[PDB]
Symmetry: C5
Subunit: 206 residues, 5 copies
């Protein structure tokens, strides 16, 4: 397990082979989660890209956080989708926290510490635990079948995952980088594998 | 009596059956009131919605606080209406306080602690006490006949009602959430009934 | 004499009969003056309106402070006009101080503590003492012949008048509401008569 | 010698006769200078105007600081011109400092404490001591031949002149109005001659 | 060695012959570098210009930092180019730091302390040390063959070079002008030769 603190993964070249795979010590299926990650790319005005792809043997978009050009953030669970329209994107690092609860279907999406309105998605579903988690690519099979036009170019870091919906107060401490304990996927205790042109570098964001 | 402090009602999906009814322990008719409530929705650019709807068996728009698409806030009492035109809408939680006095007919409308110009509506009228208060819908009968195109999608909370016009200073302490005592409808002592797809969740706003 | 501190006159409907008349104990004619007042209205994009009208039996526009739509402020003394162009105007309460000196004819106009450039008007003129001062209407005869399209809708207060040009430092004190001593017309010691639909209410501005 | 501190010259009418002449106790020609001044006018969007005219028997534009409509500031020495483009202009008092060095021909222009890029003008030239310094007008003969379309309307003050290029640090203390010692033309100790409609008034800028 | 602290080179005319050449003690070739500098010019809207130009007898664009009109910054190493698009640009001094590493090919570009996204360029290349470094011009032969349409006009200073990629934290102390030790090219210990119309003056930026 590596402390990746103060570091980011860098995807400096457009490739369909470059990705990192994150491994979860996960067993019980997720009835709810929060995923938070900090990323930086200039593609936002150019094309869509996959921020965070979680896949299962049955479902290649089991969780996907996707920037879709001109639309904004696409958040999709169990192959279903909602949009959080973004009117004008800015060339700066962006922190996102997004969380989903099966009991209510409530999705929260938080961008740079400000909440988007809660939306309903896929009420009562369960996210499978037998998961392939990938950064840098969108996977259309379990751990594979990437597309070059969907790769992330730029940096991703602070990828942390919880099996419960963080409260707004908790999410604020994440955004301020207070101390917190991710119990599904922990940037301070990460397990990962690297393929292709990918690098570990000091994080550009504070 | 429930303390709803730091909690909001969430209407996550458009429907004509999800609503909350609020119960007022009210005997005398109102010669004046202040309604304050804090709400959050992204519908504003898209369609109209009922923020707060007070009805009586003789009048289905006895008090209505309504967002009119492209217009702004519509405030109407006793079936008559005035507009507080809003030039451009931010996508953020908004706190409104509206107050009406029969003796003068003066309407005060306050948005995020800044006053709109005072306007005249229904001088000498009186609002009935035997009333249905509903959040999330506009009611065209004494407690029913909603319309899906008028349902609120998003969050509402801190709904407080007084049987008198708050001074500007008092309204400022509401907006800052200083201590205050609502004597018609109190968020810290609320009595309510939930119907349909409505959830109680931590408030997104501070 | 009434302390009107913290209070404003409210003109909540368009009418040609709602006005207040202010009484000045003047005897000696004015060679110079400053008038300061704080007002709030939403008419500014809609139509022109009289802010402050001082009339004498020979001259209905002996002093007029007038908002001319798309123009901005019209300041007129002795029936003669100068324009302080305002290109776009915020929907907020506005403090104005305007000072005129016969000896030089210099007009200073101050809006929310910022000076406009000094302009010349009616060098050597003198404003008569035996005067009718009216708020909310434009006098086309000595104390009468109002026009509905020229009435103020909204609030006016802190109306203070001096028979001398305040220095810029003094005017900055007025803008901050420090202690000051108006020696022609004093909000803290006002003499007035109310006519028609007009109300006295807590001031909305700080 | 008069202390003009906290005072400005006011040119309230457009005219070709109102000007003030400033007397320099100047006995050695200038190989370099700094001139700094505060002025305030609304002409900027309307027409060109003479901010500071320094003339000699040999040349009527020995130094000229001139606002030229839609262009911005024209700075000219020895009859030759450079422009400092100002794309959009604000209705506020403006402080300028401008300093020229013969040895390098470097012109520094500073507006409200921010430097414009250094530019070259009249390297090796020598500005004459036999000087007519005029405020409010552009003099096209030695102390005369004004043009009404070129007069300043508004205020000018704190005119200070040095026979050397101030460092950026010194310029910053002028902009903040720290204590300083002008050794050519001193507002603390000015010698001046007023002609026509010009007034001395308290300064409007801080 | 000269301490050039608080000082800048000034290029006040467009010319072919105005340049300065900088010398390095360097002998071992650069597998990586950081170059940081302050420059100030008004050309950005008008034409392209060379900010920093490092050449070797094999390659006249061995490192080039170039402003290309409407593009923004062009960063080129070994004759190969990448763009950091700048959407809109304004007349202020600008601090840039640019760092390249052969092992990864990662380019960092920092403008006024904010990072641009890391990009890939000329992975595994090696930059020769037997080098001509020139400010003010772009050299298309080893120390020669400039073009007037590519000269810098305005100021350049604080030119510091390291043979390693500064961390983000180190680059932040450069931007704040903390103490630091450039081990290739040091503004506090500079060796240089001046040709043509060039001057040394107090820096305009803080
Ligand atoms: Ca997929
Ligand atoms: Ca795909
Ligand atoms: Ca109704
Ligand atoms: Ca309805
Ligand atoms: Ca009149
Ligand atoms: Ca009239
Ligand atoms: Ca001339
Ligand atoms: Ca002329
Ligand atoms: Ca070249
Ligand atoms: Ca070239």
């Amino acid at each position: 397990q590596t402390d990746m603190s103060r570091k980011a993964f860098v995807f400096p070249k457009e490739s369909d082979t470059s990705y990192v795979s994150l491994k979860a010590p996960l067993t019980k299926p997720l009835k709810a989660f929060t995923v938070c990650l900090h990323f930086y790319t200039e593609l936002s005005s150019t094309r869509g890209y996959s921020i965070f792809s979680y896949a299962t043997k049955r479902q290649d978009n089991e969780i996907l956080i996707f920037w879709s050009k001109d639309i904004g953030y696409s958040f999709t669970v169990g192959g279903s989708e909602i949009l959080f329209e973004v009117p004008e994107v800015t060339v700066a690092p962006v922190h996102i926290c997004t969380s989903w609860e099966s009991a209510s279907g409530i999705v929260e999406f938080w961008v740079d510490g400000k909440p988007r309105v809660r939306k309903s998605l896929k009420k009562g579903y369960t996210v499978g635990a037998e998961a392939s988690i990938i950064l840098g690519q969108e996977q259309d099979s379990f751990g594979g079948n990437f597309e070059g036009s969907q790769s992330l170019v730029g940096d991703i870091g602070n990828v942390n995952m919880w099996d419960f919906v963080l409260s707004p107060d908790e999410i604020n401490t994440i955004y301020l980088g207070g101390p917190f304990s991710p119990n599904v996927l922990n940037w301070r205790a990460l397990k990962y594998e690297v393929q292709g042109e990918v690098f570990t570098k000091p994080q550009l964001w504070p």
